[PDB]
Amino acid sequence: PVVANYENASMAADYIKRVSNVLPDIGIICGSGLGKLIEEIEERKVIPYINIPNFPKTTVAGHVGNLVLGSVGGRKIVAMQGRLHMYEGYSNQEIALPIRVMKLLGVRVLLITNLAGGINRKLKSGDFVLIKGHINFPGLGLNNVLVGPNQDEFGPRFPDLSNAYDRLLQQLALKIAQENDFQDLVHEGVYAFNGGPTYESPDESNMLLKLGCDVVGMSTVPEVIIACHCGIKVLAVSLIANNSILDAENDVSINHEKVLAVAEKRADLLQMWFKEIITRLPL
Amino acid sequence: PVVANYENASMAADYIKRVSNVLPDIGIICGSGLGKLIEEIEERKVIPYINIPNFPKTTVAGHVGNLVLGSVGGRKIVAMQGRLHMYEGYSNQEIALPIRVMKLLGVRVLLITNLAGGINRKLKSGDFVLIKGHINFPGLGLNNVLVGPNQDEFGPRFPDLSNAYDRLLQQLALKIAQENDFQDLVHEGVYAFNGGPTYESPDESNMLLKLGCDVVGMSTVPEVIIACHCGIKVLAVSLIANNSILDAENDVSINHEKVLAVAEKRADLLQMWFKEIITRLPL
Amino acid sequence: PVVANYENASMAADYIKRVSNVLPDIGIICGSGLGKLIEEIEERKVIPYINIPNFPKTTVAGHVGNLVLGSVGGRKIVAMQGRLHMYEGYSNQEIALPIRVMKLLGVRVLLITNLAGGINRKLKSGDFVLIKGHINFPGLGLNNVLVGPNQDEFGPRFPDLSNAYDRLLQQLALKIAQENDFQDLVHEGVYAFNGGPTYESPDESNMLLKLGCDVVGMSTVPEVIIACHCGIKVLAVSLIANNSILDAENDVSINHEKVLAVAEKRADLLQMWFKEIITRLPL
């Protein structure tokens, strides 16, 4: 098995730099149905994962898996087109290697979107949540993404996550929403990581409310932890597909079809917002 | 390792159909000490797991492991004699394959019993609990039974569990208890899945009370999830061995000997109840 | 892979008994920075793990790994110099084998120290907590140290943990603190096991307060469970590095450097305390 170590990440970065002359300082990972911005990257290069030395094998799951480099708003970026999720069975080492390759390529800021369920009673379908902290049930339970030997070249044995979600990036995101008069859609909140792939049950939703969670989803926290470990700043935004607490009270259900319809409804606005965030990131 | 896929499940079903001419539409999985009904199946065929292509290897744990097919109350059934538990070290694929074989054989309803600890203060040793929902600590923590590639022939990538415990089956079970005047023993409640094999500690019991759990046990939820994923209806009933909250307050303990004595005390009544449930299942 | 079974543990014990003539009835496992007592064991023998048949391989992590046998206060002891932690990726079998070797060598009492974060509001940096119970998030979530086949020669399939932390040993520890006038530093409390290696996040700290936890750490509970399973009595003491709830309210952070500085501040007192505990253990 391929470890997410310094030598293996260096070999992948070497291949990438040879194929493209882009030196990116921003990385992006987009949620399901929320990837249209990647198709609008300028002067771009598309690199299938399967072609990159030491990238994880993704043919069992199938579907798209490419690294895309180019320019947005005059800024140099790298995007993952086809996110890796831990409910698919990928190991800690497979999730971590692409983020550590980003670090070696020069990435200093990582922007992430996801689809999530609403727990807080003020959250409605179609709302956005700026993530300010998390509750990591896999990590408490011996499935943290950093379980294994520490790769000292990237970061410390025992990371502190108290500043994992950069405050100034949350402030910039909100400012742009206010300039475009959609701030009434924008909240902040704590994200619960449900390993998945089943949606949280009605009684799990009720438990998460008691525990101070605002939203629940099946992604994001592994990549945030690998980024924080190696000194990359993070902004993470959830798009709310439903309120799981209301659905429990009324005996109705979420499904993946309903999730994807909400994604389609907010895709173009999210694309515009993130384009402007990228343009406005401090120098 | 043998994946719980369509081809592997089909090969096991083929062997079973050749050895027996029973086309079952009901499946049963019985808790420890609660298996006497299996010995009373009519015109029956006993098939050791070890003889069935692609069934999981169970010789390290030892003890009984047979699939039993025959008739109860004029209805065609298949039973697992010797349940597989995840605390023994079985993988997701090993737990799932027997349930997916049931699906291919024709099973539409799965009836399950277990032994559990009482958390809700109205529960006493010897009571029965109709399970109406669950809190899946392994699933929140990246050990859900569906972690891995999705087997699309059986079900969707992201299942909804809100109707995993069929309401009409709970109603039929209660009606039969009322007809036989043992309804004062019958409650409903939320089941917490403790991966095990240690009993939950006194402080874990107190935590589960705060979180809205009514009972706690080490089985059932993996099989419920595999069944729900592939469209099989479920009734699950816990037999209460003790009240863990009272034991914590009084500084006394449960053990496996005490559990088995409670099983013996309620075995014959549970056998009669489930015989009638099977007979009365809607056509 | 080497299973923590009776034959494999017996082969390791044989080697140890040949190299040393010490028959220990006390075992010790010391927290990071808290190992000075081991360097003061009398008439001692140091045995590198790498030399002992069937001991787990520890070269990937590196750092010290020795078993040390000798006398303290006239009592015969065995110490682990270099603790194994589950966040390093060691399996259940690797953690359990050294404790089962202790059992075969004659150990009846196991004394443990660790470094932990404070959750209860009465806990300050530099305080000691006598552990009276635990909340085992890995165990609830299918990562209990006993997941796997049961090794029947050592203990039962389903252990009861209600008396895992011996009450009389807690009383002796407190009595010695009172004799030396440092009882104002000594509390009792419930320990939450965070699998690690990230420190619990600010929002995880707030959750643990709601759930009745007094301290949080990344060790101890696996060894306690293996010891309880095979009938070894346990005293476990946490040294508090910080109050995570105050740090969350004030937006400040713990780190490993700060932890180690607290260890240095209390090391000599902890060494004196444990020397006297060992001397005073009942015959």
Ligand SMILES: Cc1ccc(O)nn1
């Ligand atoms: C929409 C959604 C996504 C993931 C999760 O755990 N719950 N709800």
Ligand SMILES: Cc1ccc(O)nn1
């Ligand atoms: C009787 C019982 C069974 C399982 C569990 O976790 N707690 N109590």
Ligand SMILES: Cc1ccc(O)nn1
């Ligand atoms: C000092 C400390 C150690 C471990 C943990 O989980 N939290 N705080």
